[PDB]
């Protein structure tokens, strides 16, 4: 269902709150799908749970606006995915570091434009961050690993003794 | 285009809404209305409504007038009211002062049905005695200034600046919308309709196949208005004890 | 007029308009349905109301 | 027979107040 | 770290002690009823952030200042109602919000000594009342303010009478749901 609307969250059991404290209002979800393939990739949602925003239901104008934004985002996401898929002893470590700094920008873009998770490369990125000494929990999920992907990574991989 | 509401059509269309009269009273009205209309010199006289009482002798109320004129931006009808308890003999329902209007507004409950009774109120302890017919006349005045519904653009202004039937009226374009109806005391062409009233005080049910719209007052439950669009007739009636519904915000 | 409209959020009514109408029915049917006096005979072993065959209208 | 709105009359109705907030354990 | 027990079921402390006196994380379990406490201590007094399970299953999680519920916290009552906000002297005090479980209504705003005094009261559908409430003297009953009903979108200002009859200052109008 590319769109769900619960005009009163109190009437639904299955709805779940993130602060674990029941609230009052309406909720809307729009499953972002790729037009060329018909697969869902994202989910854009809005709500009016009381203390933050007035607990009233959503008018049809705002629901339609959310739908339109979901569709425009589906278009832009398809386009960006198309472009990204198109774009595809110390001496030893020094050579490795130079070779990595060569494709620094290429790998950076290829990672920062990957919404899904590559199972193979993700293990290696985890291991690299652990070796460089990261908190080991600020990258435990692919969405959190995105915070590390930056030119500072290869810089610190270069500036590393032993 | 009708020239005056017909009591037969009113009682026929508003019977589903429970606005009915006894059979004897129906016959008695059929005889008594013309007599009183002639002997009072009035151009129009119709059955306004029926107020229930505690002893079973409900008050029938009739309203008549001669001509309506535009004064100070309002279509003023110099109306005169009569009451009856059998449908055969009409007595006058005399106006009430402004000071007594407040006191009778404070009196609630179903009327007694005894025109000689008078209620008591206490103030700073000065006691007032208010006759029952005073209470009746004020309830009628309140209900009248609240509803008095006619279709929009069914009246028109003439050269002498008087409000007369618009004999070229073609009908309401959208009979299921509150814009098609207005208060009687709104001047023609003033653009003030029932949609300018407090939102939620009117209900409209429109049978689009037969062409009969029913407008019910929710502020004064008991006031019904009907509009038949294929024959271009309309008319209203009040039936009930005459008290306003103050809990409306909790009931919608 | 719609048998599935919401009745009210507070006080929490447990049902839709159909249940509220059933409740109004159950109250009115007990408060207002009447027969002429002496038309029936009340049994004390039950609540069954049998009509006396001798009741002058 | 009944014909009406289903509204009991008598003027004995007023808005319902909130339920009483539960008091603590040690009273 | 002495798990100093108290035979009378009997108490069971399981935590740390600096030469007798308690300080740090610990789990003290009364034996008369079953009320347990897991949290910090100071001089043996429950102090800091600490969860408590009372005899009647009323759970608490939040701050304590010398064995009494103080500061920010969250309480789950035995019926199901929830409170989140400021406690003071072991009661509701300051700012907070209370959620009933049955009606699914909520109260939000200023409390005073276990009772609700000012703010908003919203229903499950979005309708609300805003203004001065009764308090602990009363039973959190509304006293003076405005009603907004969502289904009709109507707004009426007024107050209550000694009997509980709503007395409107004026007729209703069309308005919005008090986002003040």
From TrEMBL, chain B:
Annotated disulfide bonds: 104-138
GO cellular component terms given for this protein: axoneme
Signal peptide: none
InterPro entries noted in UniProt: RSP9
Family: Belongs to the flagellar radial spoke RSP9 family.
PANTHER family linked: MITOCHONDRIAL RIBOSOMAL PROTEIN S18 (PTHR22069), RADIAL SPOKE HEAD PROTEIN 9 HOMOLOG (PTHR22069:SF0)
Protein name: Radial spoke head protein 9 homolog
Organism ancestry: Eukaryota, Viridiplantae, Chlorophyta, core chlorophytes, Chlorophyceae
Name of the gene this protein is made from: RSP9
UniProtKB/TrEMBL annotation, chain E:
Coiled coil: none
InterPro entries: MORN
One Pfam match: MORN
Basic and acidic residues composition bias: residue spans: 9-19
UniProt keyword list: Repeat
Origin superkingdom: Eukaryota
Gene Ontology cellular component annotations, sorted alphabetically: membrane
Protein name (Swiss-Prot/TrEMBL): Radial spoke protein 10
């Amino acid at each position: 269902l590319p769109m769900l609307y619960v005009p009163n969250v109190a009437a639904e059991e299955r709805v779940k709150f993130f602060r674990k404290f029941p609230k009052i209002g309406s909720y809307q979800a729009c499953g972002v799908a790729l037009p060329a393939s018909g697969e869902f990739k994202a989910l854009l949602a809005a709500d009016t749970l009381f203390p933050e925003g007035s607990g009233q239901p959503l008018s049809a104008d705002d629901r339609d606006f959310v739908w339109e934004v979901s569709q425009s985002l589906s278009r832009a996401l398809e386009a960006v995915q198309a472009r990204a898929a198109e774009a595809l002893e110390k001496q030893a470590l020094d050579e490795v570091v130079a070779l990595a700094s060569s494709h620094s920008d290429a790998t950076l873009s290829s990672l920062r434009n990957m919404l899904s998770v590559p199972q193979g490369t993700y293990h290696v990125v985890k291991a690299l961050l652990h070796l460089l000494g990261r908190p080991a929990a600020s990258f435990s999920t692919w969405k959190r690993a995105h915070s590390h992907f930056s030119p500072r990574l290869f810089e610190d991989m270069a500036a590393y003794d032993a | 285009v009708q020239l005056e509401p017909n009591i037969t059509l009113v009682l026929k269309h508003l019977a589903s809404c429970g606005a009915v009269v006894s059979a004897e009273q129906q016959a008695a009205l059929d005889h008594s209305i013309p007599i009183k209309r002639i002997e009072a010199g009035l151009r129009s006289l119709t059955l306004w409504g029926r107020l229930t009482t505690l002893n079973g002798k409900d008050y029938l109320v009739a309203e008549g007038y001669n001509v309506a004129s535009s004064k100070e931006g309002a279509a003023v009808y110099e109306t005169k009211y009569f009451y009856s308890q059998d449908g055969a003999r009409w007595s006058d329902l005399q106006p009430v002062d402004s000071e007594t209007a407040t006191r009778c507004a404070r009196i609630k409950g179903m009327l007694s049905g005894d025109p000689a009774k008078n209620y008591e109120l206490e103030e700073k302890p000065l006691v007032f005695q208010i006759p029952e017919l005073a209470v009746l006349r004020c309830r009628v005045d309140a209900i009248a200034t609240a509803t008095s519904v006619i279709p929009t653009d069914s009246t028109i202004l003439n050269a002498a600046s008087q409000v007369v039937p618009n004999r070229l009226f073609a009908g309401a374009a959208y009979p299921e919308k509150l814009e098609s109806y207005q208060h009687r005391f709104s001047l023609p062409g003033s653009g003030v309709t029932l949609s300018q009233d407090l939102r939620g005080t009117w209900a409209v049910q429109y049978d689009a196949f037969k062409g009969v719209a029913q407008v019910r007052s929710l502020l004064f439950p008991g006031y019904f208005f009907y509009y038949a669009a294929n024959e271009l007739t309309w008319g209203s009636l009040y039936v009930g004890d005459g008290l306003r519904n103050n809990d409306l915000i909790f009931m919608l | 007029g719609r048998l599935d409209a919401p009745v009210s959020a507070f006080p929490a009514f447990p049902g839709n308009e159909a249940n509220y109408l059933r409740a109004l029915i159950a109250r009115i049917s007990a408060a207002t349905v009447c027969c002429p006096r002496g038309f029936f005979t009340a049994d004390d072993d039950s609540a069954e109301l049998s009509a006396n065959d001798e009741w002058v209208p | 027979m009944y014909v009406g709105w289903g509204i009991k009359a008598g003027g004995e109705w007023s808005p319902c107040p909130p339920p009483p907030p539960v008091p603590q354990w040690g009273a | 770290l002495g798990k100093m027990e108290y035979p009378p079921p009997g108490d069971k402390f399981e935590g740390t002690m600096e030469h007798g006196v308690r300080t740090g994380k610990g789990t003290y379990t009364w034996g008369v009823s079953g009320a347990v406490y897991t949290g910090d201590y100071v001089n043996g007094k429950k102090h800091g952030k600490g969860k408590m399970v009372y005899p009647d299953k009323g759970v608490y999680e939040g701050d304590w200042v010398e064995d009494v519920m103080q500061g920010q916290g969250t309480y789950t009552y035995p019926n199901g109602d929830i409170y989140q906000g400021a406690f003071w002297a072991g009661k509701r005090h300051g700012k907070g919000m209370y959620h009933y479980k049955g009606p699914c209504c909520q109260l939000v705003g200023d409390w005073a000594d276990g009772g609700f005094t000012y703010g908003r009261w919203v229903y499950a559908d979005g309708s609300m009342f805003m203004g001065k409430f009764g308090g602990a003297a009363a039973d959190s009953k509304p006293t003076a303010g405005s009603y907004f009903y969502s289904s009709s979108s109507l707004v009426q200002e007024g107050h209550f009478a000694k009997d509980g009859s709503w007395v409107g200052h004026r007729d209703p109008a069309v308005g919005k749901e008090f986002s003040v």
